[PDB]
Amino acid sequence: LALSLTADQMVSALLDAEPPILYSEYPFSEASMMGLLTNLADRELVHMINWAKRVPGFVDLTLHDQVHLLECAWLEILMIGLVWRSMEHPGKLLFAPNLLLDRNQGKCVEGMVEIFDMLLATSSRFRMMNLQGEEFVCLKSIILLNSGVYTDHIHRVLDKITDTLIHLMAKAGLTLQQQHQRLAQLLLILSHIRHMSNKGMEHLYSMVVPLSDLLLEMLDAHRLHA
């Protein structure tokens, strides 16, 4: 069914399924800072799960398979959304409209400075390339389906999203050479987002906060191989 979609229908479907931008709870210690993020991330997780169901092809998977992809990709998905939100705010991370953080604020938590800089680097990289929302929703879906597939139907869908991405680039008036170059530039960034996710969960499953029973359940999925 998702295979029968057109590129425009694909984009439209993906845009319409976008989760809302949630607000944070209205200086920072290590506990409070961690408290705010955990709460925010816990709430976002609920919308991500509903967003996932509307990603063309995702409902076709067994429940076991759906759970697996979500367990692997959840932080990656949180991260690319953050990086995207912080698009028009250079030097800052926009966790929420009422929670705009910089480097120094990221030093409040042990080891978070390193990931902050990476997150900021990814943001400016998106800014430098003028990442469009249509491309963003395509990328985010790819993360969900690709992370982690090797952990056939999915690859048919992945090819479809690739088709969509190129279709968008051709629309924007890019030449063939500029098209594959930009495609490559975008997928290579996903490699870094994977990296940021892995280092992020390295710390996450060592920690103070209350931490949701759902959030610990997502974390427990990655502890199994620590």
Partner: peptide, 10 residues
Amino acid sequence: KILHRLLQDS
């Protein structure tokens, strides 16, 4: 799992 519930949830 709590994730099982939400994925079948309305």
